Design a protein around this ligand. Structure first.
Ligand SMILES: Nc1ncnc2c1ncn2[C@@H]1O[C@H](COP(=O)(O)OP(=O)(O)OP(=O)(O)O)[C@@H](O)[C@H]1O
Ligand SMILES: [Mg+2]
Length: 656
C-alpha cells in the first residue's frame, strides 16, 4: 500500500536493507567512521548544516578545512533569483596552496597520486613534492606566456598524472582552466576553446587509453585553424611519437619547464574568484560552460570526500573516472588532494588488458575506496565473475557509483563481488552544476537500499515538487521533481558569459528553488530515489513512467546486459514505450527466438511495474549511444524512434 515503490529487484524488500558492514564499524582495526553508527547520527549533524542557524557550522568547517590568506567576515549572501550567490566573500585563499603546498610542508614524500598507467608495468607513485614541483614549473611557464589572474586556459589532456599539475598550475596563478575530454572531436574542442576565449592551450602529443592511441596533437591542430585567439600551445611528450609542431606557437612541456624554477608563488584569490569552466556532456541538449568559484567549491569537495567516502589520512582513494568530467575535477584532484590523501589517476579502461584490471589495481596499491560509474559496473558484470572471484580486495571499505541510477541487479553485483558483502555502497547523486555530491549515504551511518541515494548531504535541503501544481509535496511516499531550497557552498555561480541561460535553466522553472531536472521520489522511510531525467519521462495513458523503473525491470531477465527505454507518440496511450536491449555476448539468439524474448521482457515488466508499462516495441542492439561521460543518450534514441559514434548507424538501420 505504498505509492512509492523501490526500483525492481530480485531480492525481496524485507531482505534488501544493508546496514554498515563491520569494515565501516571501526572493527578489524579499520578507521572509525566520522559519522555513525546509525541514521540519527547523520541527522544530528546534518541539522547543523541547514536552516537559519547553520552559519556557525559552516564558518567553523571553512576555517578548519582550508588554509586562508585572509579570514572572511560574511558566511553567505545572495540567492537563486538573480544568481548572486556568495560564500565567505571577504576571504582569500589559493586552491593549489590547499591541494599541494600545505601537505608538502608536512610530509613531502607522501604519495599524492597513484599513477596507474595504461600499461600496468609503467605505473608509479607520485609524491606531493614531485606534483608540487611540476605544478610550479607549469605555472612559471604560463606566467612567461603572459597569463594573468582571470584569464582562461584550455586543457586537452588525457588521464596522465601531469593533468593534475596543469589543473593546479592554473589555479596557482588564478587562471581559469577549462578542461576538455581527451578524445572530443576537433569541432567539439574548437567550440569550447572559442567560447572561453583562452589564449593558451595545454595538451599532449598523443594519448593512450586501453591500448589505443588518441591523436591529441593532431586534433588540436585541426581545431586551432578556427581558433584565432590561441597564441601558445604547451605539448606534453606522453608517447614520444612524431607529431606536427608549429614554430613559435607550439613548445614542448619538458623543454619549457626545464627553463623554469621549481617553485612559484601563489596568487591570493578572493573566495568568489572563478576557479574553472567545465562544459557539460549535453545528453539533453547543447552543453553549457559551468563556472565554479574557489572557496565554496573547494570546501564542498573536501567535505564530501571526507564524509561520503569516510576518508582518513592514510587512505588511497581510487576514483577511476576521467578529469574531463566533473567527477574527475572534484573526486580525483580537488577533493582528495585538499584532504591531503592519496588519489588515483587511472589511464586505462575497465577491461584493458583484461576485465580484471580494476581488481588487479585494487590489490596492487591496496586501495581503500573505489569510485566509478554504473556503465562500467554493468560492463564488468557482463564479462563474468571469474575476473573478480579470486581477488583479495579486502583493503576496500567503500564502493561508489555516480553518473546514472544504478539498477539493483547491477547494485548487487557490485556488492557481492567487488565488496564481497563487506563494503558499503555509496550511490552518489549530483550534477556538474552542484559541484559536489548532493545526495548520498554516509557509509558509517546509513543502511542502504539498492538504487537509492538515501539522504541529502550537509548543506543540502531538498524537496519534492508536484510539477502539475508547482507546490512542494510534504511528507513521505511522495513523487515528483527534485529541487533545493537554499544555496550551498559549491553551487555553480553562472554559465560562462551566459547568465540568462543559468537563471532560465535552474532558477526560473520553480522560483525560489534550484531545479535539478531529475525526477525523484521519497519513499515511506524518507529515502530519496532518483528516477531519471524529467525529459526522459514517458506518459502512457496518464501513467508517468521513469527510465530507471523499466530498465531495472528489463535487466532482471537472464542474459540482459544493458537497456534504455524512450517514449514516442501513440494514438491510444498518448505515448508508447520503446526498449533498446543489449544481451550478454554469450547469449544464444538463435536457440531463443526473439519474439519470445520480447514477450518474456514484456511480462517481466508487467509483473514488476504494471500492465501499462510493457514496451510496445523492443529493439535488440549491440550497444547504446553513450557520451564520453558514460551516460546513455536517450535523447538520440527518442529522435530515431521519431524519424529525425558508430553505434548511431546500427540504431537507425534497426529502427527501419
Ligand atoms: N547517482 C545518480 N543517480 C541518478 N542519476 C544520476 C546520478 N549521478 C548523476 N546522475 C544523472 O546525471 C546528471 C548529471 O550529469 P552531468 O552533470 O555529467 O551532465 P548531464 O546531465 O549529462 O548534462 P546536460 O544537462 O548538459 O544534458 C544528473 O542530473 C542525473 O540525471
Ligand atoms: Mg543535466
Amino acid at each position: 500500500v505504498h505509492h512509492v515503490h523501490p526500483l525492481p529487484d530480485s531480492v525481496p524488500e524485507s531482505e534488501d536493507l544493508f546496514a554498515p558492514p563491520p569494515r565501516m564499524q571501526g572493527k578489524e582495526g579499520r578507521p572509525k567512521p566520522h559519522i555513525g553508527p546509525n541514521y540519527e547520527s547523520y541527522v544530528k549533524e546534518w541539522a547543523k548544516t541547514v536552516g537559519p542557524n547553520s552559519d556557525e557550522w559552516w564558518a567553523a568547517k571553512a576555517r578548519e578545512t582550508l588554509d586562508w590568506y585572509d579570514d572572511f567576515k560574511t558566511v553567505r549572501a545572495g540567492g537563486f533569483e538573480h544568481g548572486d550567490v556568495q560564500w565567505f566573500p571577504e576571504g582569500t585563499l589559493n586552491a593549489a596552496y590547499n591541494c599541494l603546498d600545505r601537505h608538502y610542508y608536512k610530509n613531502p614524500k607522501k604519495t599524492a597520486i597513484i599513477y596507474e598507467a595504461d600499461e600496468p608495468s609503467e605505473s608509479r607513485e607520485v609524491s606531493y613534492e614531485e606534483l608540487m614541483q611540476e605544478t610550479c614549473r607549469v605555472a612559471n611557464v604560463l606566467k612567461s606566456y603572459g597569463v594573468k589572474k582571470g584569464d582562461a586556459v584550455s586543457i586537452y589532456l588525457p588521464m596522465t598524472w601531469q593533468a593534475a599539475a596543469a589543473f593546479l598550475a592554473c589555479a596557482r596563478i588564478g587562471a581559469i582552466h577549462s578542461a576538455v575530454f581527451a578524445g572530443f572531436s576537433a569541432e567539439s574542442l574548437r567550440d569550447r576553446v572559442n567560447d572561453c576565449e583562452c589564449k593558451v592551450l595545454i595538451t599532449t602529443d598523443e594519448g593512450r587509453r586501453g591500448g589505443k592511441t588518441i591523436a591529441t596533437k593532431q586534433i588540436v591542430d585541426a581545431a586551432l585553424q578556427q581558433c584565432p585567439l590561441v597564441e601558445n600551445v604547451l605539448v606534453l611528450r606522453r608517447t614520444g611519437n612524431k607529431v606536427p609542431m608549429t614554430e613559435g606557437r607550439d613548445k614542448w612541456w619538458d623543454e619549457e619547464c626545464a627553463k623554469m624554477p621549481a617553485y612559484c608563488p601563489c596568487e591570493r584569490m578572493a573566495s568568489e574568484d572563478p576557479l574553472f569552466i567545465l562544459y557539460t556532456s549535453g545528453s539533453t541538449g547543447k552543453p553549457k560552460g559551468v563556472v565554479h568559484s574557489t572557496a565554496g567549491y573547494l570546501l564542498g569537495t573536501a567535505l564530501t570526500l571526507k564524509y561520503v567516502f569516510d576518508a582518513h589520512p592514510d587512505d588511497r582513494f581510487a576514483c577511476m573516472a576521467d578529469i574531463g568530467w566533473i567527477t574527475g575535477h572534484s573526486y580525483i584532484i580537488y577533493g582528495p588532494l585538499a584532504n591531503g590523501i592519496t588519489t588515483a589517476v587511472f589511464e586505462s579502461t575497465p577491461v584493458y588488458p583484461t576485465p580484471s584490471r580494476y581488481w588487479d589495481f585494487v590489490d596492487k596499491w591496496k586501495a581503500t575506496q573505489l569510485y566509478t560509474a554504473p556503465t562500467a559496473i554493468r560492463l564488468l558484470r557482463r564479462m563474468g565473475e571469474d575476473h573478480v572471484k579470486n581477488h583479495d580486495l579486502s583493503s576496500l571499505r567503500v564502493l561508489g557509483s555516480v553518473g546514472e541510477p544504478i539498477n539493483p541487479e547491477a547494485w548487487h553485483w557490485y556488492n557481492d563481488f567487488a565488496g564481497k558483502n563487506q563494503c558499503a555502497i555509496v550511490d552518489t547523486y549530483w550534477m556538474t552544476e552542484t559541484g559536489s555530491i548532493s545526495i548520498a549515504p554516509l557509509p558509517g551511518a546509513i543502511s542502504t537500499k539498492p538504487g537509492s541515494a538515501t539522504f541529502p548531504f550537509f548543506g543540502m535541503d531538498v524537496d519534492i515538487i508536484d510539477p502539475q501544481t508547482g507546490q512542494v509535496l510534504e511528507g513521505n511516499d511522495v513523487e515528483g521533481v527534485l529541487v533545493a531550497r537554499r544555496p550551498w557552498p559549491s553551487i555553480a555561480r553562472t554559465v560562462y558569459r551566459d547568465h540568462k541561460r543559468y537563471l532560465e535553466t535552474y532558477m526560473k522553472p520553480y522560483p525560489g528553488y534550484f531545479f535539478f531536472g531529475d525526477g525523484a521520489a521519497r519513499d515511506y522511510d524518507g529515502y530519496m530515489w532518483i528516477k531519471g531525467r524529467v525529459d526522459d519521462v514517458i506518459n502512457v495513458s496518464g501513467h508517468r513512467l521513469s527510465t530507471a523503473e523499466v530498465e531495472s525491470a528489463l535487466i532482471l531477465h537472464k542474459g540482459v546486459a544493458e537497456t534504455a527505454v524512450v517514449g514516442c507518440a501513440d494514438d491510444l496511450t498518448g505515448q508508447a514505450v520503446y526498449a533498446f536491449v543489449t544481451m550478454k555476448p554469450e547469449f544464444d539468439l538463435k536457440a531463443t527466438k526473439e519474439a519470445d524474448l520480447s514477450k518474456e521482457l514484456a511480462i517481466q515488466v508487467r509483473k514488476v511495474i504494471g500492465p501499462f508499462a510493457a514496451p510496445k516495441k523492443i529493439y535488440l542492439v549491440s550497444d547504446l549511444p553513450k557520451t564520453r561521460s558514460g551516460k546513455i543518450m536517450r535523447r538520440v534514441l527518442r529522435k530515431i524512434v521519431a524519424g529525425e559514434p558508430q553505434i548511431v548507424e546500427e540504431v537507425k538501420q534497426k529502427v527501419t
